[PDB]
Amino acid sequence: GIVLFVDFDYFYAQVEEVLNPSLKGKPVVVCVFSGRFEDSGAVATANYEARKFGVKAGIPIVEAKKILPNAVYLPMRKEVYQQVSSRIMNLLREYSEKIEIASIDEAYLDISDKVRDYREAYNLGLEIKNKILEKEKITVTVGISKNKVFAKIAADMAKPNGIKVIDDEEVKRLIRELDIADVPGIGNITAEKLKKLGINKLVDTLSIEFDKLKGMIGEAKAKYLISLARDEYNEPIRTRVRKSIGRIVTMKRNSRNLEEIKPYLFRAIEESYYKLDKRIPKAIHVVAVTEDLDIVSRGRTFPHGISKETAYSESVKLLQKILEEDERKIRRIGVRFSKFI
DNA sequence: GTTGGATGGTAGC
DNA sequence: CTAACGCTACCATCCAAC
Ligand SMILES: Nc1nc2c(ncn2[C@H]2C[C@H](O)[C@@H](COP(=O)(O)OP(=O)(O)OP(=O)(O)O)O2)c(=O)[nH]1
Ligand SMILES: [Ca+2]
Ligand SMILES: [Ca+2]
Ligand SMILES: [Ca+2]
């Protein structure tokens, strides 16, 4: 079983250079404006020229404009990007029919049946790299290893424009040496209790017991981490099916005025039912984000699929239900559908 | 003495 | 208006219905 993995490089940004090569070699920042006020909102992504200064995805657009006044600030075009993804995802079907679209820029492959050893695998990722580059002008990063995790890890090591094989032997090696907070599945919070026990190596896990660990990080995590440490771990490729569909909007000013929030909410519902396209959901959750940016929500689940009209009326209740229990002014509000038939 | 649902915690794009 | 998008997936916890 050989698992190759691909993660496109500074994606949305790289796409924009493709369209506007006069940007090439000059820091670019891809923005999710929010119409609150001029330059309100956050950064989706930015290229490596920009990242050198500290402008990562996440940071507020006003921080970036502080840091990089003379850069190119661009409004995110998810739809344009989704196209370059889609196409690039169809190429990858030429190489393997066992393909698991992870994100918009990431897909795993099972090439195990297409090649025989990591050397032939290497050669594939190399052609795969050239395939995409010739047809879409996008550099990517290929990460190869025996299973999904380490593949995603082997790429995260090669980024950008890299290609990296992690073979059985190098795998023994990382379990011992790889810094725990670099494992896919580990955020800062979990990466913070891990030092609290002593587990800094992906293998350290094995020097602690079984329980207290889980009593600190949870059941799935213990049975995730320990398996990798004991290298028994193996996660299979499957085609992923979208389980939820949302839309959420920031309001021009914070409110508790139901007649003020309503039109914003009805926006989300409309654009949701389009983003649905034929999927009939049985569950709705109205999610609002509050002033202190704590995100809070209320949902309902129907024994049957919901019509557009149903969710119009049901969402209102839910918003009321939210107004009943949190007395804080709402800042962003949207809706979320799940449990499709 | 589970199964699911309602809310939220964490982690990654 | 005065900083913090928008999106998805998965697990942990808690309380009722069975
Ligand atoms: N709105 C928004 N978009 C994001 C966020 N994180 C990532 N994206 C978008 C922009 C990225 O190009 C794309 C994939 O995320 P990545 O982790 O791959 O960042 P990126 O690929 O641009 O860096 P790069 O490929 O790794 O060297 O999705 C985020 O927090 N918010
Ligand atoms: Ca990625
Ligand atoms: Ca990427
Ligand atoms: Ca981490």
Resolution in A: 2.9
Which nucleotide across the nucleic acid strands is nearest to A44, CA versus C1'? C5
Q: Which of A144, A166, A188 is the last residue of a domain?
A: A166
Q: Report the DSSP beta bridge partners of residue A20.
A: none
- Is A94 catalytic? The answer is no
Q: Are A129 and A100 found together in one domain?
A: yes
Q: Are A45 and A96 found together in one domain?
A: no
Q: Which residues contact A320 (CB under 8 A, 6 or more apart)?
A: A258
CA dihedral A225, A226, A230, A234 (to 10 degrees): -50
Instruction: Look at chain A and report how many structural domains it folds into.
Output: 4
Task: Return binding residues of A for Mg(2+).
Answer: 7, 105
Sheet holding A99-101, edge to edge: A99-101, A106-110, A3-7, A142-145, A163-166
- Is A203 among the domain residues? yes
Q: Cα-atom radius of gyration of chain A, to the nearest Å?
A: 23
Sheet holding A330-338, edge to edge: A244-255, A330-338, A283-290, A295-301
Q: What is the DSSP letter of A51?
A: H
Task: Return binding residues of A.
Answer: 7, 105
Cβ of A159 less than 6 Å from ligand 1: yes
Residue A198 CA to B2 C1' — how many Å?
36
Q: Which of A179, A205, A233 is the last residue of a domain?
A: A233
Q: Which residues contact A247 (CB under 8 A, 6 or more apart)?
A: A267, A268, A269, A271, A272, A275, A334, A335
Domain that holds residue A184: 167-233
Q: Are A6 and A145 found together in one domain?
A: yes
What's the CATH number where A26 sits? 3.40.1170.60
Nucleotides of C under 7 A from a protein CB: 1-13
Question: Which protein residues, judged by their CB atom, are less than 7 Å from any atom of strand B?
Answer: A 7, 57-58, 102-106, 152, 184-191, 283, 285, 294, 296-301, 321, 326
CA dihedral A205, A165, A104, A284 (to 10 degrees): -30
